[PDB]
Amino acid sequence: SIERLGYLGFAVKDVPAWDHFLTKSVGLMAAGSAGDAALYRADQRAWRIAVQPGELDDLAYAGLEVDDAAALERMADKLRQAGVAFTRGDEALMQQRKVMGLLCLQDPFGLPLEIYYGPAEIFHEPFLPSAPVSGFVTGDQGIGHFVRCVPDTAKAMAFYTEVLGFVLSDIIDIVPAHFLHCNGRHHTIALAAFPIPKRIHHFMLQANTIDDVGYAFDRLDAAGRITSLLGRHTNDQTLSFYADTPSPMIEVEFGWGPRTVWTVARHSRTAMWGHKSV
Ligand SMILES: [Fe+3]
C-alpha cells in the first residue's frame, strides 16, 4: 500500500555544510525553511529533503507516500491490525510537512517513518538547480532510495513487506543485502545488516543524463568527497559514484539509467563494472 518514498529529513551537526553540499555540489534548489528545518527541492514538490540541526548526524525521518485519504485510512487499519503503534499528525506537523494526512510510526530498530498523502506542489515557481544538472527522475518513483542498516534482516523484512507492503526485488551478498520495491524503481529500500553506527548507509538521487553524473563527479571530487569511482550495479544497473556527505559514515550516490522492475535473483557482487573504492 505504500506507493513511494517522497521525502527525507536529516538531523545534522553542520547545517552550513549540508546546505552548501546540497546546493552547490548535488545541485538541489533551496526552498526556504519550515520550522528549524531548511528545505530543498528536486522538482515540483514544495520540498524533498529537509535538513535540521541535531547531534544525531543521521536520517531523522522518512516520508512514505500514498495516493489519497482513503489509502491513508487503509494504512491506519493495517498498522492497527498488525499491532504497530502509530499516531495521527496534528495541524502543527501537517503544515510543517505540507501534507494533508499524516500517520507517524517507526520501523523496529527505531527509524521514524511518516506515512502521508496530499503533498504540496508549486508549479508557479519552477525548479532551478544550484549546480548544472538537467534534472532528477522522481515522479511515480518517488525521490530515490536508501540502504537501511538493521540488526536483524528477517525482522526488518517482515515489517517492510508484511505491514508496509514492499516487495523483494533481489539479494546481493555484499552480509546479504535485500532490495525491496513498491513501484517501478528497482528498489526504494534496501535492508542490510552492516556494522555501521548509522540508520542508513546512503541515499541516492537519479539524474536524467550521464553527463549530469559526470559533471557531479567532478564537483564532488574537487571538494574531496569521492569515495567510489563511477560504476554500474549488477542488480538495478544504476550507473553512479558515491561521495561523502558532511555527516560521517553516511554517503550519497548520484546515478543514472537504472532498470525498472519480476523475478527474485541472487548476485554475488554489487558492481557489474567500476565502483572501485577510493
Ligand atoms: Fe544504492
| Adjacency order of strands within the sheet including 101-106 | 29-34, 37-41, 49-53, 4-12, 58-65, 112-117, 101-106, 87-88
Just give the CATH number of 1-132: 3.10.180.10
Fold matches, 1-132 and 133-278: yes
Yes or no: say if 160 and 189 are a contact pair by the CB < 8 Å rule. yes
Nearest alpha-carbon partner for 271 in 220, 214, 233, 222: 233
Centre of ligand 1 to C-alpha 137, Å, is 15
For domain 133-278, the CATH class is alpha beta
User: Ligand 1: distance of its center to the CA of 191 in Å?
Assistant: 11
Beta-carbon contacts of residue 145 (< 8 Å; ≥ 6 apart): 5, 185, 187, 188, 189, 190, 203, 204
Using a CB cutoff of 5 Å, list residues around ligand 1, an ion.
204, 253
**Domain locations in the chain?**
1-132, 133-278
List binding-site positions for Fe cation: 145, 202, 253
Q: Which residues pair with 128 in a beta bridge?
A: none
Rounded Cα distance, 79 and 75, in Å: 6
> Cα angle vertex 62, ends 254, 55, to 5°?
90
Grid cell at residue 122: 508549486
